Amino acid sequence: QLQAQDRIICGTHGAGIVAHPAADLSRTKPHEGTGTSERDPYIRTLHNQRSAAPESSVSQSHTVNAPTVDECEMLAERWGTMNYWHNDTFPRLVVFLK
Amino acid sequence: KYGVAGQQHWAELQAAKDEEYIQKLDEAAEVYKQLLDQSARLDESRRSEL
Amino acid sequence: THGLREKEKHDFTILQRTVRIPFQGYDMDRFLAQQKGTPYGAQQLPPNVVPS
Amino acid sequence: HQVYLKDMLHLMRYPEPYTHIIDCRTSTQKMHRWVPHSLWLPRDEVEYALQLSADEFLDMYGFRKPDKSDDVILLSHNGIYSEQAGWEWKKQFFQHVYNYRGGTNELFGESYSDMNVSDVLSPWKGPFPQSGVFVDKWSKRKVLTRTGPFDRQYEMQDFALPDLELEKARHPEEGPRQNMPFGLQ
Amino acid sequence: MLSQNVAKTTVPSYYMIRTNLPHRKPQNQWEGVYYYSGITKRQRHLILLHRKREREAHMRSFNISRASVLQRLEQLSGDRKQESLPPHVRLDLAVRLAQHGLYQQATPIVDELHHQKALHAGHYALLINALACPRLGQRILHCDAQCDPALTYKLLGDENGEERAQEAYRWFDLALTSLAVDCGGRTQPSHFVPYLPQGTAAASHITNALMRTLLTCGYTHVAAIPDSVYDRMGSMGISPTISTYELVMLALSLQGNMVEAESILSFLRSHHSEHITVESFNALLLGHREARQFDCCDAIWQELVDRRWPRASPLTAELYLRSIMDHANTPTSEPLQSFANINVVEKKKVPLVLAQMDELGVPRTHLSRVLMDEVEDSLRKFQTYRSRFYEWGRAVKQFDFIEFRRRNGWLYDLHLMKCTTKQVGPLRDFNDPDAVQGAVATAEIPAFFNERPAWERPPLEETLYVTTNKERYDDVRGGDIYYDDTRGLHDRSPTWMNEVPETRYDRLYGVNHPDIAKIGIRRHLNVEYVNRKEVVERDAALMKKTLSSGRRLRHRVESSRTHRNAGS
Amino acid sequence: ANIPRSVWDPAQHNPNWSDSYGHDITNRRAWPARKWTVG
Amino acid sequence: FRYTNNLIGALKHRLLLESSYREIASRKFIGNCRGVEVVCSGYGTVLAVQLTDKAVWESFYRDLDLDKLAESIKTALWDATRKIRSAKEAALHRSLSHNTRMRASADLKHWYEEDANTLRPLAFEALKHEAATPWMQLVQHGKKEEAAALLKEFEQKGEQPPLASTLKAEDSNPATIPIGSVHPLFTPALVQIEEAGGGSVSNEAVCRAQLWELSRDEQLFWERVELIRKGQVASIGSSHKRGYADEAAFAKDDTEEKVQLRFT
Amino acid sequence: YPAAVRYGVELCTVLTAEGKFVDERGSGLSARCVVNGTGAAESVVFDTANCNGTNTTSVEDALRVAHGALRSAQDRHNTLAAFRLGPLSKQSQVLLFCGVNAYEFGGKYARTYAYAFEKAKKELEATAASGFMAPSLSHEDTERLSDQPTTSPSVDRFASTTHPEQRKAQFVPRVGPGSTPLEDPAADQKSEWS
Amino acid sequence: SHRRDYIRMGYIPRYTPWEWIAIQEADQPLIAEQIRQDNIGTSYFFSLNRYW
Amino acid sequence: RASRTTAEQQREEERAQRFGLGRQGALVQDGGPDQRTLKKHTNDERIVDAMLFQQNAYRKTPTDEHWNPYIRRSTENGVGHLLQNKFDIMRREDRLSKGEQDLTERNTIHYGVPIQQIVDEFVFRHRNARGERPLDYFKPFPNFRALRLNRMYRDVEGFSLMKQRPEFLEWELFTRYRQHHQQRRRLALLHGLEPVANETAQERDTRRHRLDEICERTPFDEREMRVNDDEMRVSVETLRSWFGVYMLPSPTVVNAV
């Protein structure tokens, strides 16, 4: 819901709510930085590991999506619920009969 | 007048005052140690006087 | 070793008190583009510096 | 840190380009042999030697001053003067300062002593020193500390000798301790 | 004698009866029970010696095998060079040479066989697989790969993989030509020429062998497998197989690309069920371990536990266990390293996965020796039984632990031995300064919580100064029973010259700039002795004239309008 | 992993999670009872 | 200790590289492109160029397509050179990965320093080595006894890599490289310690050099200490020094000093 | 000197030469080719204008003339490199030969260098024997205490090898990551996994 | 660790940080039989007539 | 020659002055030859020697203290020691050239500062962050939405251009549009025509067309409209009178358009 969240929360050091003679050729510890600019903050608030959005809480076995070409090809072998076969949108029994 | 510059200048003044009081406290500690040594000598002399 | 680097970090920390949240605009992409001067009609000429 | 006789022999057989072996033996009248790959730096003058600059050290001691990063091995008669020199060097913040505690006595079979310190301490004469009197911080009761007449050095000395015959000769035939009661031995 | 045996008990007096002071400190609720999970400094030497001996035995076995194959080559090809060796004998000799890492010797044999048409569809794939040096890989795994299958591919590629890769490509092209010829010969009346030999199963087997042997050539060929080889297979029309897909997954995992490696297995899962083996799962585990995705590695392991088919192999168990070990042996950053290393807790789940291995049927003894050593360390650190729990933490055991700590000189973290001599006062606020405060509760919190700023502290205090904390012998009404005396490392007696032997520097008598060159022995030691004072003075005298050269009057001539006037 | 990534990963950030002071200030506030001219 | 360990690691690396060079120079590298194969030795010199199969390639090359043939030949030569360079770089990688003394130095530089452009087998040095006679090859590679025997016998009496009569399979063994041949850069200086006959080190030469240096250093040390003593005696008075006392931590024991004496 | 030789070898590596060959049998076709100095070729071409009205040459003749052109180009480049690097190499040879005393392999340190070379050979042979895995820097895998070298880090150097609080490198004991001891680690603490 | 007002200003946390959680969990070992696992079944004629 | 030697002397003298090299006065003092007077925040040769000693007192190799994995895998100085094979080196260089994160930099676990912690620090430094809190936070009973902070959410996209301070009633028109879209999505959920996961362009167009058909005939719900902090309760007829009917059209206007 947050606008531009990929660069405000997941991309910006300090989540965008922080402001931004350092020597050159200096090895700094990964937990901090020189502080020259936003890309090199005094304290790095972004992790160096892999990022991943939380696993979707949307039910997967209940939502009925549009039928694909491969799904139509394998429709005869595939099983399904009665609601799957007589779905309100994109019924599968009609596709099987066709 | 100065949101951060005034804070830093007052910090400098406070640091100067703290440094002066720190050196004064070091002098006080030195004189207190000398007083402790004097008291120890006086107590030893009083013990051995008899 | 003198420690003025962590003094710089502490000065940044105490400066963060007086800051306030910047205004990224309602349309953030539009606002960032306007700041960059990229959209049509948003070009601003640099000030005419006096010659030496 | 320590340096051993095997290390010294290895260095003698194969010298290294930047390993300085410093001889701290003073009183050159008592010095008679030359340690291999060794430069003489007197222990009495080491304090000023470390203060001297590179050229000031070179023109004063005949050889260039080893740098901090270079390891320096200190040899003396018994290791006492060399150990004090190592203390001076480490106070002057040299990185690798090793001391050969075997010394000239082990390396050449000499009996010269640099300090001639008597390990045995003379028996205490006089009262207990008031500097060792301790008082508790609650009841203001004065107690004693292991100093002066009652010293751990005095306990280490006057102890049972490692030799059974020597201890039996030290004590009379009746027993080791007999002036004390039966339950105090 | 060590300066950590502080006298916790006070001097005996009437206070111990008159006051309600406790005679011991209360037990620390959040202090763990001491238990012994260390190494005697000799078991490590023993295990290192055992590992070295096993490694030497493996090297000896490989050297014996390689000497045998070299002797067979010398006595077969070098001897009967004129004699026409049987095609199968030449094929097996070439396969052995390729497997033992000798690609140079085998190449002419296979070239001669291809020229003589002795090679066939299965034989090309066999030669390509032999080119991967399985025996060399088996040697290096137990000798210098630390029994790491992931590192085995890298080392085998470093074993001159570029030449092997080029030979594999050439053999693949020759195999394609031979398959085309054979299909044309066999399918003459069936009119199926245009779909062959790419439609045949032999082409799939040969390209699978090519990719499998390219996996052990280098980073370039491993990365080129799914980027170039897979696309070439698709363009030619060779149907991929489960081995092809798993080799692509392994190549992507070695590259570190995990999104594509998950995508291909997702395609297999959605379309080709009852065709997936444990190779895909262990390839994903290896890739996540390489890419530092231990959470994903654990998720894949849990999924494999949930779905019993396909069965978990010892390779899969080893991969997951060493991924756990790598996760546990990884440091955090400085803010998280304030107290201790927190990733060590990752070894506490090793018994859980061992129990899961026992439930699944995975042998515990079918693991590598180094991983077994790490597993034994983890079990020693986080493993106990009810029998040992019923008697651990006895008073004698705890005090023996304390005695071990005293002998090793580490008494800082022991509750019964630690003594807090320093205390922290309050901070007076500039607002409302007329109110005094008081303590309500006392906690032993570490020093770094309230450590003074670095700039408000002498730099390099630890080495520049020596600070000793000791108790005052005299009675103090105000307090501060234990005070710290700080003396500079370079502190000297004020009359230092009087208690030192007389030296040769006393002539200087405190002059700021002594003539050390004049008083040194080097001047007499050497003959020439260029002197700095002399050279400086000589250079100044020689260079003053160039520094100040001066000016001269220049004659001026009246400039005529039509010419230039001359002069003499 | 012994530390769920839903506590440090910004990709799993909780928008609805307020700060540690606003709720305490609000539920400490005791509004004046003279909303109406009578009672 | 640091110097010795670093020198041992560097010498092991150089030995590995020299063995790799000796094993690579006596090898064949074949580049194939569209039926035209170019075989080159370990030094990059082209040994042969020939058509693999005439029946299947003459029709493809057609008169004759000189453009196609030249492009194929150039491609084959480039592939062969790529193979040679890759082999040398892979040997370097094996040495770096198997060496731990160098690994103790946490420097990525060593992986790029001696890359696949400055190793011992060099194309622009191929002619000076491969075109040489067997005696020249032996003396360059450091086979003192072999060269001496060849000189005494042969000269008195009267498609394959040329550098193969000297660089054999056993030469690739690490326990064969002479001290004067392990380091090509310092060869003219290292040849001095190596004995005239045999690649082994003659201990007599190094012992004599060390003895001469030790004698010079001992005499110089004695002169220095004599001068220092003379200067110290001159700068002080009587030829004696004030004693040095141990600080220790024992009590002063000055009770007897406090006692005075008066007269009645 | 090492910088000079590296500059020379890199420059000769990147510089390219040219060579031409003419057939002396049958048709008078010729080829010309350039060599980059690594042994490869950037361009090889044939000239057919000089050829008469036959066009009967076969593939083997073209291959032979191309091989001859390649050989000529390689020899040309080798001679060019020799002429480029000659004087520097000779001056370096005489410098190295006559300035051994100003080196680690000349004078009192030649014996040290020879000993280091011999021990490096022995250690490489041991590594080859032990599965191409180097022995531990501190000789912890040695079965005998007489096999560890004097220079090996196995031997301790701390004074007071028995009493703690004195087996430390610096003036004050230090700690590593967290609060673990640093001056003298334990066997279980010095884990060398992976 | 970053907090400097832990008890000086009375900043007592009501939630134990994950670092302390990990330290306290890793301090103590795990009971091996604390995990439940069985597939053979129950010893009908044994598991009660064991050694004394 | 004079210029060269003077340049060398000047460089040495400036370095010595900057780092305070050399003894501080007389070489032979009564109280020992080493008498240094340290000053606060000043450079000194003793300080430089002490820091070098602390770094490398008895260091034989840079990896001397790498016996433990936590020290060994540190990424402060670099990844040179972590890299050990050419395969890893090539993988790292390929990742760097492609722009993705280097795998070797993951050898050190670095959790950053959680967003909750950042917000807590911000609020603590800003004394409840009263300047950033919404006005509803100061109402009697705020909920979590008006209790968390003031951000910008994905509901202002694709509206009339609005400056830092929007013009008169423009924000109210925006709130009306937001309520209109909320009712539109409520109608879409009530009927069919839900946005499905894998929908092509044709399916999306048909769904959107049918949703528009079914929504053009459904009256707007007046009750669902609400004001947040200070939005003036303005009627649809008033908004039409101000901005023109085309902004909030009637069904006849929609049909005519």
From TrEMBL, chain A:
Residues 26-41 have a biased composition (Basic and acidic residues). Residues 21-41 are annotated as: Disordered. This is Uncharacterized protein. It comes from Trypanosoma brucei brucei (strain 927/4 GUTat10.1). The lineage of its organism: Eukaryota, Discoba, Euglenozoa, Kinetoplastea, Metakinetoplastina.
Automatic annotation (TrEMBL), chain B:
This is Trichohyalin. It comes from Trypanosoma brucei gambiense (strain MHOM/CI/86/DAL972).
Automatic annotation (TrEMBL), chain E:
It comes from the Eukaryota. InterPro entries: TPR-like_helical_dom_sf (IPR011990). The lineage of its organism: Eukaryota, Discoba, Euglenozoa, Kinetoplastea, Metakinetoplastina. This is Uncharacterized protein.
TrEMBL record, chain H:
Residues 135-194 are annotated as: Disordered. Residues 147-163 have a biased composition (Polar residues). This is Uncharacterized protein. It comes from Trypanosoma brucei equiperdum.
